[PDB]
UniProtKB/Swiss-Prot annotation:
Its EC number is 3.2.1.17. Belongs to the glycosyl hydrolase 22 family. This is Lysozyme C. Keywords: Allergen, Antimicrobial, Bacteriolytic enzyme, Disulfide bond, Glycosidase, Hydrolase, Secreted, Signal. The gene is LYZ. Monomer. It comes from Gallus gallus. GO terms for molecular function: beta-N-acetylglucosaminidase activity; identical protein binding; lysozyme activity. Substrate binds at D101. It catalyses: Hydrolysis of (1->4)-beta-linkages between N-acetylmuramic acid and N-acetyl-D-glucosamine residues in a peptidoglycan and between N-acetyl-D-glucosamine residues in chitodextrins. It comes from the Eukaryota. Lysozyme C is capable of both hydrolysis and transglycosylation; it also shows a slight esterase activity. It acts rapidly on both peptide-substituted and unsubstituted peptidoglycan, and slowly on chitin oligosaccharides. The keyword DNA damage does not apply. The keyword Hydrolase applies.
Amino acid sequence: KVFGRCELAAAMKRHGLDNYRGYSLGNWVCAAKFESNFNTQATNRNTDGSTDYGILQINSRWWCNDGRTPGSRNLCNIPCSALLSSDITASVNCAKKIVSDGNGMNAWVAWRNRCKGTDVQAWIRGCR
């Protein structure tokens, strides 16, 4: 599924992300936009053989199991395919664990390079 901007904001708010560990809703929508273009089915392969999955592009090297990344951890305790669902619950719950591990949202390269230090509130402007 490809979410709308305001549609995704409302979904993320319901799931407890607004100000989670100090990050306003605008940060999370901005990261989804540049990581996946709001598409739950997005995948991308990395140099080291790991793969990124879904709306927030979560990495098989540490967070989920996809059966083809030798020596990797499964810290969110899920198959990577569950992260591509039209229901964003599994992605949200896994992301909550990632942003809590000490490095905040710096774990998402596109947030660091394209959202951080910008007017992120603009990403939720106009939404009910």
